[PDB]
Amino acid sequence: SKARVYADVNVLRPKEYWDYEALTVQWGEQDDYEVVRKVGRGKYSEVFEGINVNNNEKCIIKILKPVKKKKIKREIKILQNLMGGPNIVKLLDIVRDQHSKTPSLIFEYVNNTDFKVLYPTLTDYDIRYYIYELLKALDYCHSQGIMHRDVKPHNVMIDHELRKLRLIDWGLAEFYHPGKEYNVRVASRYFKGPELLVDLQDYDYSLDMWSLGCMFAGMIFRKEPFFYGHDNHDQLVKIAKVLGTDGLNVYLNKYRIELDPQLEALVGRHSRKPWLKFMNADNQHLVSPEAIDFLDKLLRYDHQERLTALEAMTHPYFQQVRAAEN
Numbered sequence: 001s002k003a004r005v006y007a008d009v010n011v012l013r014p015k016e017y018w019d020y021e022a023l024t025v026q027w028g029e030q031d032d033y034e035v036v037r038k039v040g041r042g043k044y045s046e047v048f049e050g051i052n053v054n055n056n057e058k059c060i061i062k063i064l065k066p067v068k069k070k071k072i073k074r075e076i077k078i079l080q081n082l083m084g085g086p087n088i089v090k091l092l093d094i095v096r097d098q099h100s101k102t103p104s105l106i107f108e109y110v111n112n113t114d115f116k117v118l119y120p121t122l123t124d125y126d127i128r129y130y131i132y133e134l135l136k137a138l139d140y141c142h143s144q145g146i147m148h149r150d151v152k153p154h155n156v157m158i159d160h161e162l163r164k165l166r167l168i169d170w171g172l173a174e175f176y177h178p179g180k181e182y183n184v185r186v187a188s189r190y191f192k193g194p195e196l197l198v199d200l201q202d203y204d205y206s207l208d209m210w211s212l213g214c215m216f217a218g219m220i221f222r223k224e225p226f227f228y229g230h231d232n233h234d235q236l237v238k239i240a241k242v243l244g245t246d247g248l249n250v251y252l253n254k255y256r257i258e259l260d261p262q263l264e265a266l267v268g269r270h271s272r273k274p275w276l277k278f279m280n281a282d283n284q285h286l287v288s289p290e291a292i293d294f295l296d297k298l299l300r301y302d303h304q305e306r307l308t309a310l311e312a313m314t315h316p317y318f319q320q321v322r323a324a325e326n
């Protein structure tokens with residue numbers, strides 16, 4: 001399998017662009033940036049609101065947990081390559097503690113509201129707006145040869161006052177090369193595409209569009225997370241119970257993949273559940289025919305069948321957002 005768009009990006013570009021292991025980091029001054037308060041954390045980092053003591057402007061200090069050289073260089077290289085692209089978080093500096101060599105990444109500050117409290121307040125129009133802004137970031141990173149591989153609401157910072165969105169945490173992101181087999185242990189469980197769950201390793205940018213579809217379904221149906229599996233096997237079961245197993249079998253046959261007998265037994269056989277079955281009184285004002293058409297075009301087993309980010313942005317679902325911008 002191969003990406004249907006942007007497959008040649010890293011091929012045309014000089015090796016320096018994608019050869020992240022050859023990067024040599026130029027370290028800033030640790031002292032320039034002071035921690036004000038903790039804002040977040042995950043398996044690989046802790047995140048603090050900070051102050052640049054020179055200009056007294058706010059920043060984000062991302063303190064990395066013990067990480068291998070290769071992986072830190074990958075995140076840094078991707079951030080540098082993408083710096084300045086639409087709605088991509090801006091990496092401003094890279095610093096380290098002299099004693100322990102603990103690295104911190106320094107970013108622009110976004111006055112975020114956590115999705116668990118933000119998303120339930122969003123109007124129909126705001127959902128269309130913010131999904132469009134997120135699509136700008138994804139089309140940009142894909143156009144630059146990069147898959148994010150961890151799209152989820154936790155990685156989308158929104159200053160709802162300034163209507164500003166940034167796609168953050170490029171720590172799982174990778175360069176796309178035609179024919180390459182990737183680790184499937186990427187993306188957060190609830191946002192893992194079928195490709196990850198059935199061990200299809202030669203995946204591409206389309207993985208992010210599945211994750212976006214999950215995020216989107218969660219928003220319009222007010223069911224967060226939308227596919228709620230307890231482990232990676234259960235995650236495929238949850239998907240199969242929505243999309244149906246008939247669709248799953250054609251997919252598996254196309255890419256000549258056989259499931260583990262344990263997984264096959266858990267998946268069983270399931271009818272397709274139409275999208276309107278998720279509609280209720282609470283989500284009613286969000287679940288229009290255009291929303292459904294758009295969602296249906298993202299949540300496809302076959303990664304080659306999903307809308308590209310560029311296509312998604314042209315969907316009639318976003319026509320009002322485009323018109324406002326034009």
Ligand SMILES: O=c1cc(-c2ccc(O)cc2)oc2cc(O)cc(O)c12
Nearest residue numbers: 039040060107109110112168169170
């Ligand atoms: O402005 C923010 C930026 C970041 C951030 C987190 C990881 C990155 O690679 C880059 C930026 O995380 C946050 C996490 C929060 O809970 C709140 C934030 O405002 C931010």
